[PDB]
């Protein structure tokens, strides 16, 4: 207890100190980025010590050190919860951020506000550990809206650009629409129960909880960019690539799922919501993946890869497998961070070019980046015994062999196939074929920082899933008996996806003209949801205002 409670809070206080030394003191400017990187370096190791204790004996804590406010029969404390989800997630988030803080030292070396950038990266991390460790809903909101702001400030890092400012406001608008659901849950629990604490919520277990769960689900629809509120996640790639890796693909976007994983005790009983979360996830994984095929910018493709996966997490929530979705979040962070970091090497070497059409022939010019770009891409699709396999495979097994919506079961598998098609398109266009980038060649990735950062997460994309899956305590009755085809449905569609993809790539070589198909145009333009909705709604609200 002594060690568990003390070191659970050194991590949170260890991250803040770099923030504190910015406001006061003057011991070391100029070397701030490395000072920050070490804080996360140490905060990770200190965060492992409690994790080992949790594995050994399943020890779990609640720490409510400070009494802040007592609104009559409602007492608000600074309560941290160091349980199954907090203990596993924090080292994963710190480990991923560790490399990114090192990949940013290289990707953002010239930019003169490098110190300011590292201050915002750290201030996000602080508002994310607050979100995950929070024990009461009000403290959850500080993290919920804390990340929402830090997205605005980082997405619009280059504030001269007019698209950056538009993309930042778009991030706020969709999240705050989702945060209507969060307050609705907050109001319901106080009105019908009597606390924002999670402990009392689970103890009472309301039987009729349709309204609060719709509100909670609505928060996940906006925060994690599900269908209906998804356009912001693609358009949020306007920020520096380290931002897109750390925030809008590795961690922050999971908080929408993380909110539903927190409330499994209630959602397990409520079938009516399970259908909605399943249906909500089913459409988003297909739609975004369907859009991913025809995209041409490497950041945009990997952006839709995040959304398609996130929908798979939402389906896992629906099929009543909350602990798998948590595993998918942790395994997903490693290889999706590596993808973005690798795409950062290509973009930085080709002089700020994101279009894959102008990339190619890098398979030999950038060995290290190419190796990781393969390792990461294989994890996503479902290569056996890679980090992605331990999570995605089970999710497909549990979806196939469970009482579920037929269409939702089918869409998941179709989207899993599509996950194979655009896993190759990054490889085929960016790694294979003759070069297509401008003449002057400056492709150079021989830097220790970019390499060490990529090397570390490369190991995670291999062995992290195996270690995590073995150590974590059993929590459900896994299904290991099923028809052979359902058992290997995941692998077959992944294999069938590759075959169709490679054939499509080869057809691109053949000297035959291009023919426009409505299915093709719908894919490339994102279904016209961004175009119609970002034009009709802004026009109506702004125009109605004068009347």
């Amino acid at each position: 207890m002594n060690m568990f409670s003390s070191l659970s809070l050194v991590t949170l206080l260890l991250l803040t100190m770099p923030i504190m030394m910015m406001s006061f003191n003057t011991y070391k400017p100029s070397n701030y980025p490395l000072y920050v990187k070490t804080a996360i370096s140490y905060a990770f190791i200190t965060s492992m010590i409690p994790t080992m204790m949790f594995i050994h004996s399943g020890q779990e804590l609640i720490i409510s050190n400070w009494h802040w406010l007592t609104i009559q029969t409602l007492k608000l404390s600074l309560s941290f919860k160091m349980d199954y989800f907090s203990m596993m997630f924090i080292p994963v988030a710190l480990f991923v951020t560790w490399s990114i803080m090192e990949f940013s030292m290289w990707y953002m070396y010239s930019d003169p506000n490098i110190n300011k950038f590292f201050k915002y990266l750290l201030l996000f991390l602080i508002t994310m550990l607050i979100l995950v460790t929070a024990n009461n809903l009000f403290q959850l909101f500080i993290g919920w809206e804390g990340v929402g702001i830090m997205s605005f400030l980082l997405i619009g890092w280059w504030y001269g650009r007019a698209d950056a400012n538009t993309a930042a406001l778009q991030a706020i608008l969709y999240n705050r629409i989702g945060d209507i659901g969060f307050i609705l849950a907050m109001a319901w629990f106080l009105t019908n129960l009597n606390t924002w604490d999670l402990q009392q919520i689970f103890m009472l277990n309301p039987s009729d909880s349709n309204m609060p769960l719709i509100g909670l689900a609505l928060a996940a629809t906006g925060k994690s960019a599900q269908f209906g509120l998804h356009p912001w996640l693609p358009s949020a790639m306007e920020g520096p690539t380290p931002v897109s890796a750390l925030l809008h693909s590795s961690t922050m976007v999971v908080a929408g799922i993380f909110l539903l994983i927190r409330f499994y005790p209630l959602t397990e009983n409520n079938k009516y919501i399970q259908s909605i979360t399943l249906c909500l996830g089913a459409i988003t994984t297909l739609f975004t993946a369907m859009c991913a095929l025809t995209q041409n910018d490497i950041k945009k493709i990997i952006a839709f890869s995040t959304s398609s996966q996130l929908g798979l997490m939402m389906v896992t929530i629906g099929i009543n497998q909350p602990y798998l979705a948590f595993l998918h979040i942790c395994t997903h962070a490693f290889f999706k961070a590596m993808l973005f970091m690798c795409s950062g090497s290509i973009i930085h070497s080709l002089n700020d070019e994101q279009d894959i059409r102008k990339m190619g022939g890098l398979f030999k010019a950038m060995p290290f980046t190419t190796t990781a770009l393969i390792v990461g891409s294989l994890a996503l699709t479902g290569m056996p015994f890679l980090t992605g396999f331990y999570s995605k495979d089970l999710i497909i097994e549990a979806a196939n062999t469970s009482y579920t919506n037929a269409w939702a079961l089918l869409m998941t598998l179709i989207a899993t196939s599509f996950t194979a098609i655009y896993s190759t398109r990054i490889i085929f266009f960016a790694l294979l074929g003759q070069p297509r980038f401008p003449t002057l060649v400056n492709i150079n990735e021989n830097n220790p920082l970019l390499i060490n950062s990529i090397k570390r997460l490369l190991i995670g994309s291999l062995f992290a899933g195996y270690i995590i899956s073995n150590n974590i305590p059993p929590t459900t009755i896994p299904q290991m008996t099923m028809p052979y085809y359902l058992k290997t449905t995941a692998l077959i569609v992944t294999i069938l996806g590759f075959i169709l993809a490679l054939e499509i790539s080869n057809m691109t070589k053949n000297l035959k003209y291009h023919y426009p198909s409505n299915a093709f145009k719908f894919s490339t333009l994102l279904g016209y949801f961004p175009t119609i909705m970002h034009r009709l709604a802004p026009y109506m609200n702004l125009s109605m205002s004068q009347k």
């Binding site: 207890m1 206080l13 260890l14 140490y42 399943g58 020890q59 409510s64 050190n65």
Partner: protein, 127 residues
């Protein structure tokens, strides 16, 4: 057709100006002129001691910095948090509530030396 004779001239006249101005933007070897800034012997110590460097010599310097970090940014913070948690947070009801440990069949209790009864005999499946 390209630039009329005046246009060709105007671009030429400005072009020369633009190139000179940009040339003026360069800095002199002495610049930027700075006040010296103080150097405490803590700075002086490594300035010359590591001038030659080499792997075995500077590994001490790398371990030095981490030691200064560890003591100030890990050891001292955990004394404060431990002093705070042990003598202020745990001295109030229910501040730190820990899930009771898992007690399995055939375990020994530290408090009472109790021994939990063993489980029934399994149906002796083939295993």
């Amino acid at each position: 057709s390209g630039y009329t004779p005046e246009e060709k001239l105007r671009l030429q006249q400005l072009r020369e100006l633009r190139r000179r101005w940009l040339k003026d933007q360069e800095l002199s070897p002495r610049e930027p002129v700075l006040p010296p800034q103080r150097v405490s012997p803590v700075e002086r110590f490594w300035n010359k001691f590591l001038q030659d460097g080499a792997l075995w010599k500077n590994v001490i310097y790398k371990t030095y910095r981490h030691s200064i970090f560890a003591f100030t940014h890990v050891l001292i913070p955990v004394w404060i948090i431990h002093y705070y948690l042990k003598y202020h947070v745990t001295t109030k009801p229910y501040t730190i509530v820990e899930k009771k440990p898992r007690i399995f069949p055939g375990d020994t209790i530290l408090e009472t030396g109790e021994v939990i009864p063993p489980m029934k005999e399994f149906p002796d499946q083939h295993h």
